[PDB]
Amino acid sequence: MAKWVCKICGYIYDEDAGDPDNGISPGTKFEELPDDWVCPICGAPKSEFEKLED
């Protein structure tokens, strides 16, 4: 699945991994993350992520 980078801190949201410690099971697409999910490292909103693809 896809990877998305936090443009602030460099954390990668990997859809295959999810973010279980913050309520997100593996295989959750970025677009399916709750509106108030934030970068687990720096707190940036979803607006500050970019999909890693061309």
CB-side exposure of 2: number of CA atoms within 13 Å?
13
In the 8-state DSSP scheme, what is residue 41?
T
The minimum distance between CB 27 and Fe ion, in angstroms, equals 21
The minimum distance between CB 44 and Fe ion, in angstroms, equals 4
Tell me the residue type at 52: L
Tokens of 30: 């970025």
Q: Which residues of the shown chain bind Fe ion in the complex (CB under 5 A)?
A: 6, 8-9, 11, 39, 41-42, 44
Q: Which is nearer to Fe ion, 19 or 28 (CB)?
A: 19
Annotated binding site: 6, 9, 39, 42
